[PDB]
Amino acid sequence: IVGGYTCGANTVPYQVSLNSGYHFCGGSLINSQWVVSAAHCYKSGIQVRLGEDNINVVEGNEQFISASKSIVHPSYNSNTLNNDIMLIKLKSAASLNSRVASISLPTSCASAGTQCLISGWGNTKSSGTSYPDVLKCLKAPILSDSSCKSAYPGQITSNMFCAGYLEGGKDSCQGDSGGPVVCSGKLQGIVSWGSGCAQKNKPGVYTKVCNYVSWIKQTIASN
Ligand SMILES: NCCc1c[nH]cn1
Ligand SMILES: [Ca+2]
C-alpha cells in the first residue's frame, strides 16, 4: 500500500497473508474454512496465516492453517486478468474471534463514489521498494466505469473496477495482490492489477466480487 496508514494490529480481522515460505499475497476470510484471493496468486504449498499484524514476528493472535485445495475461477485468463478470483479451502476450520473474523459477501454491487478500505503488506513506495512488516490500510473511493476505462483503454472488463485517486500518490502495490477491498462491511473487491503504483491517472484495478457471489456460494456448498 502506497500513501496509506498503519491499520493497527488485528483491526482488519478478515485480512489473511498467504505464505509459501514467505508472504506472497493477501486474501480475505469469508467463513471458517474458506479464503478468497486473486487467481494470479495461485501456487502450490500455500499456508494461510490469519490474525497477522507483523508478518515477521509471532505476536500471539495468529492461526497458521495449510490449504487443502485451491480453486481458480474456471474462466480466469492470466493474460487479460479477466475473472481474477480464486478460492482456497483450509485444512481445518479457523477459530473465529474478534481478531480472526470473516467478511460478508456483497448482496449487490457497490457504486462509483463508494468509500472502501484496501489493505495489505505490499510495497509502500511508488518508485523504490520498501516492504512493511505490519498491515497497511488505505481509504479509497470506487471510480466510475468511464474514468476507469479512460485510464486503461482496452483493458477494463465488466469484472473489474478502479478504486483510488487519479492524481496518484495513494494506491495498492506489489504484495497487496489478492487482498480485500471492503466497502460498508462487504467484500467488493480483490487487489488485481495496475500500471506501477500510485501513478497519476493509473489507479488500482480490482476484481468485481459481486459478479462472483453465486460461484463462490455454489463452490463452497460442494467442496
Ligand atoms: N495497484 C497495483 C496492485 C498490484 C497488484 N500486483 C502488483 N500491484
Ligand atoms: Ca505475526
Q: What is the resolution of this structure in A?
A: 1.7
**Most distant CA pair in the chain: distance in Å?**
46
Neighbours of 134 (CB within 10 A): 16
**How is the chain split among helix, strand and coil, in percent rounded to 5?**
10, 35, 55
Unique residue bearing C-alpha cell 482488519:
12
SS3 79: coil
Q: Which residues contact 126 (CB under 8 A, 6 or more apart)?
A: 2, 3, 168, 169, 171, 173, 196, 197, 198, 199
Q: Which residues contact 93 (CB under 8 A, 6 or more apart)?
A: 32, 33
Q: Are 124 and 2 in contact (CB under 8 A)?
A: yes
Residue 74 vs residues 93, 160, 212: alpha-carbon distances, Å:
25, 17, 11
Ligand 1 binding pocket mutation candidate from 160, 171, 191 (most atoms within 8 A of CB): 191
From the CB of 162, is ligand 1 less than 6 Å away? no
Unique residue bearing C-alpha cell 480483490:
190
Total count of residues recorded for the chain: 223
Query: What span, in angstroms and rounded, lies between the C-alpha atoms of 194 and 180?
Result: 15
Q: Report domain 13-102+211-222's class.
A: mainly beta
Query: What span, in angstroms and rounded, lies between the C-alpha atoms of 85 and 68?
Result: 17
Query: What span, in angstroms and rounded, lies between the C-alpha atoms of 83 and 69?
Result: 19
DSSP per-residue string spanning 153-177? TTT--TTEEEES-TT-S-B--TT-T
Question: In the numeric block, which cell numbers belong to residue 219?
Answer: 463452490
Question: Do 1-12+103-210 and 13-102+211-222 show the same overall fold?
Answer: yes
Kindly tell me the sign of the dihedral angle through the C-alpha atoms of 11, 105, 187, 88: positive
Q: Which fold has domain 1-12+103-210?
A: Thrombin, subunit H (2.40.10)
Residues annotated within a binding site for Ca(2+): 52, 54, 57, 62
Helix (H) or strand (E) holding 88: strand 86-90
Amino acid at 148: C
Question: In the numeric block, which cell numbers belong to residue 47?
Answer: 499456508
Q: Which residues contact 127 (CB under 8 A, 6 or more apart)?
A: none
Question: In the numeric block, which cell numbers belong to residue 50?
Answer: 490469519
Residue closest via CA to ligand 1's atom 7 equals 174
Residue closest via CA to ligand 1's atom 3 equals 173
Annotated domain spans of the chain: 1-12+103-210, 13-102+211-222
